[PDB]
């Protein structure tokens, strides 16, 4: 699209949308990590089944 302003516009729109997609992915990942932490806290912060 370097020589046609319309093609450049199209490319930039694709870029924006793909960037939004990436952001969404990042968000999901972060949230899930944070949740996995709280569950891993839940399970072991208490007296445990009888010894090995």
């Amino acid at each position: 699209g370097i020589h046609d302003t319309n093609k450049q516009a199209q490319a930039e729109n694709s870029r924006q949308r793909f960037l939004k997609l990436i952001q969404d992915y990042r968000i999901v990942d972060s949230n899930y990590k944070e949740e996995n932490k709280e569950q891993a806290k839940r399970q072991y912060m208490i007296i445990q089944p009888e010894a090995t």
Binding site: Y44, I47, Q48, A51
Partner: protein, 109 residues
């Protein structure tokens, strides 16, 4: 403390007295214990602390503490200081995990 010391000194029937010193961390407990022990003025004084017991093995610790209790039954007036019980017995709450044999040995001693 001094009162208790005189009590053990004089009485003929109370031949064994045990004390416990508890409080928040950093309250300065061992200093008090040592000061009482020193100012008592008995022939025989001894100290069991975690600080000595590093790096050695389980059988070795039980042996050592047994020896120390053996040695104190000469000399008809005696004093022993046991520092920081919980770390001698390997406490960590996560399991919780700790060594039961040592605990029993002290409980019987």
């Amino acid at each position: 403390g001094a009162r208790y010391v005189r009590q053990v000194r004089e009485s003929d029937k109370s031949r064994l007295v045990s004390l416990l010193i508890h409080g928040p961390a950093g309250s300065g407990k061992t200093a008090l214990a040592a000061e009482i022990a020193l100012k008592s003025g008995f022939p025989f004084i001894r100290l069991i602390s975690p600080n000595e017991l590093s790096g050695m093995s389980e059988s070795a610790k039980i042996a050592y503490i047994d020896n120390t209790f053996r040695d104190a039954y000469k000399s008809p007036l005696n004093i022993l200081v046991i520092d920081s019980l919980e770390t001698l017995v390997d406490w960590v709450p996560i399991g919780p995990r700790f060594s039961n044999n040592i605990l029993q040995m002290l409980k019987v001693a």
